[PDB]
Write a protein that binds this ligand. Structure first.
Ligand SMILES: Nc1ncnc2c1ncn2[C@@H]1O[C@H](COP(=O)(O)OP(=O)(O)O)[C@@H](O)[C@H]1O
Ligand SMILES: Nc1ncnc2c1ncn2[C@@H]1O[C@H](COP(=O)(O)OP(=O)(O)O)[C@@H](O)[C@H]1O
Ligand SMILES: Nc1ncnc2c1ncn2[C@@H]1O[C@H](COP(=O)(O)OP(=O)(O)O)[C@@H](O)[C@H]1O
Lengths: 446, 343, 117
C-alpha cells in the first residue's frame, strides 16, 4: 500500500485579504496553534498546477479556522480562486538573498518613462524583508498607476528574502502579459466597496454553477440562471458582474443595451443570439446585459414592432438558457418598474439583487480603492471626504478622486513647464495629492 | 439501467439505488418491468431483463441481483422518466378534474366523434398568476392521455419577422392535426393576442387575426384541443372567447396550505430529507406562494445543503459521487436558510 | 486617471455655446468637428448613423480634438418625447459612440442644449 493522510489539517479554503499586502497571509490563532506556526514566520503555500508561493503568516481575529486570507496577487501565483483549497507548511529554510532578477510585464509599463525600477522597486522592497519565489508575479502601485513584475531568478533558488543586501537585476526582454496569469487592470472583489451583503449573495448564488459545473450533470436540481441587479446609475453593477466573472474564472460577455438597439432590426436580434451562442461555447460563462431597459421595457412604454420583436427575442433566449450549460445571465437596470415583467418569470430572471447607495463606511472604502494608485499627502482625510459625500454613489466618488488627481497635476504642470520639465516616473511618484486638491474637487458643480 | 437516466452519475449506482429499493421490501417483480428509484437528487430507471424463477418472483434477502450488460436505450422502452404527470401536480384537484373530464372523450375516444354529431370543446383557457403550473398541467394531460403535445411559446412567435410568425402558427396547427389526437398549448397567449385597446400597429393585428382564423379552422381538424395560458381574462382579445374558439375557461388559483404541502412533497421526492425537516411548517408559512416559488425554494435548500458539503468535500480532495449525493441530507436549517433570503 | 470626456453646455438659445466650443478648440490648437443636430436628422436612416460614426472617426484621427454637437436635443431626446424607431436607433448610436470614446484618445465631446430635461 501507498498511504497518505486524507483530511489534512493544513488544507485551507482560500478567502479574501483584509490586510492587502502581496507578502502576507492570515490564519486564525487556533489554526496557527494547531499547525505550530507563529506570527511573522515564513510559510510555504501550495496551490494548483504545482504552483508554490512563500509568504509571511499573521493572525487575524475574524478568519475562520478552515480558511486562509490571501490577496489576489498571491492567488494568481498559486492558480487558485476564492473558495479553492491550498496547503500550508513552515518554511524556516528561507535565507537572505544575494541577488534576484526581475522583469517588468510589458503592458503594465507602457507609457512610463524614467527609472521604473528605482521608482517602483525600491519603495516596495525597502526594509520589508519580503520573501519571494522564482516565478512569482507581483504588483506595485504609485505614480497614479500599477506596474507588474515577474521574479525570473533568485539566489538562493528558488526562494529568498529580499533584504537590504540583496542586489536586484532588471536587464532583459520585458515579459509579455499574454504569457502570464495576473490581474493588472482586471476588476475583482477588492475593487468593489460598500456592498458586502449583496456581493455575498451573488457569490453564493453563482458558486456551484460557475465553479462546480460538472455537478449539474449529476443532479436534477435547477440552479438560478438569471440575476437582475437594481440600483441607481453609477452604483457598480457592471463592475460587480465583471468581478464575479474574473474571480470565478468564468467567461464574460457584455451586451450593451444601447449598442443592440443602435442596429437595423434583425441585426439587433442576430447580435443577441450570437451573444448567447458565444457564452455557451465558452461556458462556464456570465452574460451581462448593461442597461437592460433599453432593450426590454414594459409594453406600456413600447413604441412599435421592431421594439416588441427585440424584447420577444430576449425572452426566447432566456427560456433557451436551461438548455445551455452553464450560463448565468446578469442584467442591470435602474428599477423593477422599468422593464417587462415577463422577464421575472420562473426560469428567466428568477433572482433580483438591490445594489443601493453606499453608506459612510462604504464610501470610505470606495475612496480607498480609487486612491490606491495615488500618493496622498498626510493632510488627506478620506474619512472627512466620506462623511460629507452623503447620497453619492461609487461613480461620484471615482469622479471625485480623478478630479482631485487632475487638479493636483495642473498645479504642478505650471511649475513643470516653468523649468522646461518633461513628465517622468519620478515626477509622477513624488507628486502628492493634498486635501486642498480634494477640497477643490468637492467645491465644483458638475 | 436505462441509459439517459444514469447519465452523469458515477460510482456504484447499483449499490446506491438498488439495495435501498429492494432491502426487506419483498417486492414482487416481472420480467420486462421497468421501475423507477429516487435518491441523490434524481431518479433512475431500470429494466428487469430476466428473473429466476421465470417470469416473476419476489426479490427477497437471498435474491442475487445481476447488473452486468449493455445499458438499455430509453427510446426502445415505454416509461416516464422526466415526463410530467398528474402525480407531478399538486394543490389543484378540482380544476384538474374538470380538465380531465373535458378532454376525456376527444383524446381518449376520438373515433366516437365520427359517429356522433355533438361538438366537443376544442379550446380551453387556463387563468392564474405566473408560476401556477399551467404549462405543467397541459403537458401532464397530454402525457397522461397519450396525446401529441405541441407547445407554442408566445414570445417566440413574436420574436419573428412578420409572415414567419404567421407561417409558424399555421405550421403548429398543421402538425398537431397530422399527429392527432393532440394538444396545442399556447404559453403566454397575451404576447400574441392582446386586446385591441393595447395593440400597437398592424403586424400585431395580423397575428391575433391569424390565430382566430386558425381557431375557427379547428372544428375541421380532428381531434385537436388547444389549451392556452394567460394571467387573466382582461389581457386578451375577447374575440377569443367566441363559441368554437376558446369556449372553456379554468381558473388555476393559488394553492392553499394543504396544496403547498403537496407541492413541497413533489419537489423533494428525489431528495434525502433529514428527520428534522418539517414540510408542514414550510407549507404553513409560505402564504400566498405559488408552485414555482416552492420549487425554487426546494432547489435553493438543496443547493445550500450542497454548498455546506462542498467545502468539507474539497478539504479531503473529494470527487462527487452517487454515494456522496445519496447520503447527503437536506436539513431544516437548509430550508430555513432558503426561507430567509429575499429574491 | 480618467479625464472628463463629455461636457454639456446648458442655456437659452443665442447664449454662445457654439462660440464657446469653437473658441476652446482654437485657443487649445485642437481639431474641431461640428455635428449639427438637424443636419443629422435630415438624412435617410443609416446615413444619420453612418454620419455620426464618421464624425467620431475623424476627430480620433486628428486628435487632440473637440466634437461639438449643436442642438443635441434634435438627436437625443428623452424616451417620453421619442417618435418611432429610426429616432430610437439614432439616440442609441450616439450613446454607443460616447461609450467608445474612452477607447479613442484624446477627444472631448461638447454638446449644447436648451436644458437638462
Ligand atoms: N461599489 C463600488 N466600489 C468601487 N467603485 C465603484 C463602486 N460603484 C461604482 N464604482 C466606480 O464607479 C464606476 C461606475 O461604474 P459602473 O459599474 O458602470 O456603474 P453602473 O453599472 O451601476 O452604472 C465603476 O467603474 C467604478 O469605477
Ligand atoms: N401545482 C403545482 N404542483 C407542482 N409544481 C408546480 C405547480 N405549479 C407550479 N409548479 C412548479 O413550478 C414550475 C412553474 O412552471 P409553469 O408550469 O411554467 O408555471 P406557469 O405555466 O403557470 O407559468 C413548474 O414547472 C413546476 O416545477
Ligand atoms: N457671450 C457672448 N459673447 C459675445 N458674443 C456672443 C455671446 N453669446 C452669443 N454671442 C453672439 O451671438 C451669436 C449666437 O451664437 P451661438 O454661439 O450660435 O449661440 P448658441 O450656440 O447658444 O445658440 C454668436 O455667434 C455671437 O455672435
Amino acid at each position: 500500500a501507498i498511504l497518505k493522510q486524507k483530511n489534512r489539517p493544513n488544507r485551507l479554503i482560500v478567502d479574501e485579504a483584509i490586510n492587502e499586502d502581496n507578502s502576507v497571509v492570515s490564519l486564525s490563532q487556533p489554526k496557527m496553534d494547531e499547525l505550530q506556526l507563529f506570527r511573522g514566520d515564513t510559510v510555504l503555500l501550495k496551490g494548483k498546477k504545482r504552483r508554490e508561493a512563500v509568504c509571511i503568516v499573521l493572525s487575524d481575529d475574524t478568519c475562520s479556522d478552515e480558511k486562509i486570507r490571501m490577496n489576489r496577487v498571491v492567488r494568481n501565483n498559486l492558480r487558485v480562486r476564492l473558495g479553492d483549497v491550498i496547503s500550508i507548511q513552515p518554511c524556516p529554510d528561507v535565507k537572505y538573498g544575494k541577488r534576484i532578477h526581475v522583469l517588468p510585464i510589458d503592458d503594465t509599463v507602457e507609457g512610463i518613462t524614467g527609472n521604473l525600477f528605482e521608482v517602483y522597486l525600491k519603495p516596495y522592497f525597502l526594509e520589508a524583508y519580503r520573501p519571494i519565489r522564482k516565478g512569482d508575479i507581483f504588483l506595485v502601485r504609485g505614480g497614479m498607476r500599477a506596474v507588474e513584475f515577474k521574479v525570473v531568478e533568485t539566489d538562493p533558488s528558488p526562494y529568498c528574502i529580499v533584504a537590504p543586501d540583496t542586489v536586484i537585476h532588471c536587464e532583459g526582454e520585458p515579459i509579455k502579459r499574454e504569457d502570464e496569469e495576473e490581474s493588472w487592470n482586471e476588476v475583482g472583489y477588492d475593487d468593489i466597496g460598500g456592498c458586502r451583503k449583496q456581493l455575498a449573495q451573488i457569490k453564493e448564488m453563482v458558486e456551484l454553477p460557475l465553479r462546480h459545473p460538472a455537478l449539474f450533470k449529476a443532479i436534477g436540481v435547477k440552479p438560478p440562471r438569471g440575476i437582475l441587479l437594481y440600483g441607481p446609475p453609477g452604483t457598480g453593477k457592471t463592475l460587480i458582474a465583471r468581478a464575479v466573472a474574473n474571480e470565478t474564472g468564468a467567461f464574460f460577455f457584455l451586451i450593451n443595451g444601447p449598442e443592440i438597439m443602435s442596429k437595423l432590426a434583425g441585426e439587433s436580434e442576430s447580435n443577441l443570439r450570437k451573444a448567447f451562442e458565444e457564452a455557451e461555447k465558452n461556458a462556464p460563462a456570465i452574460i451581462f446585459i448593461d442597461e437592460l431597459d433599453a432593450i426590454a421595457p414594459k409594453r406600456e412604454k413600447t413604441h412599435g414592432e421592431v421594439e416588441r420583436r427585440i424584447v420577444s427575442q430576449l425572452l426566447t433566449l432566456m427560456d433557451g438558457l436551461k438548455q445551455r450549460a452553464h450560463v448565468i445571465v446578469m442584467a442591470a437596470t435602474n428599477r423593477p418598474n422599468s422593464i417587462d415583467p415577463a422577464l421575472r418569470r420562473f426560469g428567466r430572471f428568477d433572482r433580483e439583487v438591490d445594489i443601493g447607495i453606499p453608506d459612510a463606511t462604504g464610501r470610505l472604502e470606495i475612496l480607498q480603492i480609487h486612491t490606491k494608485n495615488m500618493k496622498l499627502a498626510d493632510d488627506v482625510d478620506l474619512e472627512q471626504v466620506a462623511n460629507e459625500t452623503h447620497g453619492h454613489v461609487g461613480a461620484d466618488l471615482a469622479a471625485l478622486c480623478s478630479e482631485a488627481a487632475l487638479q493636483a497635476i495642473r498645479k504642478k504642470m505650471d511649475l513643470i513647464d516653468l523649468e522646461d520639465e518633461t513628465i517622468d516616473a519620478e515626477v509622477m511618484n513624488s507628486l502628492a495629492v493634498t486635501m486642498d486638491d480634494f477640497r477643490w474637487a468637492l467645491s465644483q458643480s458638475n
